[PDB]
Structure 1
Amino acid sequence: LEQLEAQTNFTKRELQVLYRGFKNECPSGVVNEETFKQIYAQFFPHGDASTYAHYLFNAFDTTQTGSVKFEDFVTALSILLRGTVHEKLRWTFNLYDINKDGYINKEEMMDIVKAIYDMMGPRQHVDVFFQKMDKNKDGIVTLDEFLESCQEDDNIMRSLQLFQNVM
């Protein structure tokens, strides 16, 4: 846990708590997509959380090997529970960037929104959000454009930022 402590916002005792919990509740030593889906389907039982769970699982699976090891699980938790707003937004951008190419296109945003609406149990609004986010009008939202609009003081962007914070 020494290296993990040095790489995350957790002390060794916090990592021992997470580790013990991880070894008990998840014996294979990794979190598979099936587990993510179960965790979210339990919590959002009155909707279909499978797609969102899928994107979320891919967000945790940084190596894209289909297996979230303890190290990956803690790294994500470190950011989500204790990272700066800057780190949290970057983690979120990477969640929306489905195919992990470093860009978010309108379809991808559309898929993310539908996955969220499916979880909570549309198009028009997204075309409005995407247009405001794609600053240079070239059909792709880069990390820099994402950071800017998701921290800018514009009523529409503020609305979206609030939803994302609660999300």
Structure 2
Amino acid sequence: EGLEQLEAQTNFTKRELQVLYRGFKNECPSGVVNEDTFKQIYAQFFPHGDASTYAHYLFNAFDTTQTGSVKFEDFVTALSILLRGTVHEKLRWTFNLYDINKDGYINKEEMMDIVKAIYDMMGALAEDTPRQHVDVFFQKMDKNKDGIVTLDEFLESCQEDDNIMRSLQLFQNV
């Protein structure tokens, strides 16, 4: 980690990066986040829910360096993308999270995992079906109906969505 690099190579100011670092340095003094810390860092997120399974998907959404563990620099790029990046970038990031096995394709199989994994994190207040939720996704994301959603399909599909676009732009201070 070096501070004035991060300032240059992300959308955060030195001021911001510090707050972020002090945030990080407290959630694990370790400096290195493995999946177990990752899991228990969400133990708080929600009262009596279980984000165990989601932690796993979040974890190997990183390891982009593939160095076994996630260093702070990964964590801030991730955030720089999610809070400040272009719609494209923020969207591509979500896509990579959904594409569990890293092959650029999202299938019913793995979308179910995600939704279940979040439902678990949340209230495992609820009436929306688990399966009946991937279905709404695919029937309104998979353009040609081949049951497989690609990055371009997911990109163009969300740009059309007059609120999933407001979800994305509105909000960012650290």
TM-score when normalising by structure 2: 0.79
- How far residue 42 of structure 1 moved from its aligned partner, in angstroms, is 1.4
CA distance in 2, matches of 1:165, 1:19: 15
- How far residue 93 of structure 1 moved from its aligned partner, in angstroms, is 0.8
Change (3 A) 1:138 1:102: same
Checking the alignment, whether the CA contact within 8 Å between 1:23 and 1:29 is kept in structure 2 is yes
Aligned partner of residue 102 in structure 2, secondary structure: coil
TM-score when normalising by structure 1: 0.82
- How far residue 74 of structure 1 moved from its aligned partner, in angstroms, is 0.7
- How far residue 164 of structure 1 moved from its aligned partner, in angstroms, is 16
Checking the alignment, whether the CA contact within 8 Å between 2:83 and 2:172 is kept in structure 1 is no
- How far residue 151 of structure 1 moved from its aligned partner, in angstroms, is 2.3
Change (3 A) 1:156 1:9: closer
> What are the Cα deviations for residues 14-37 of structure 1, in whole angstroms up to 9, with x where unaligned?
223323443444232211111111
Aligned residues: 166
Which shifted more, 19-28 or 97-106?
19-28
Checking the alignment, whether the CA contact within 8 Å between 2:106 and 2:148 is kept in structure 1 is yes
Which shifted more, 132-141 or 144-153?
132-141
CA distance in 2, matches of 1:155, 1:18: 29
Aligned with 1:143 (options 135, 144, 151): 151
Checking the alignment, whether the CA contact within 8 Å between 1:55 and 1:95 is kept in structure 2 is yes
Change (3 A) 1:108 1:57: same
- How far residue 146 of structure 1 moved from its aligned partner, in angstroms, is 0.8
CA distance in 2, matches of 1:118, 1:45: 12
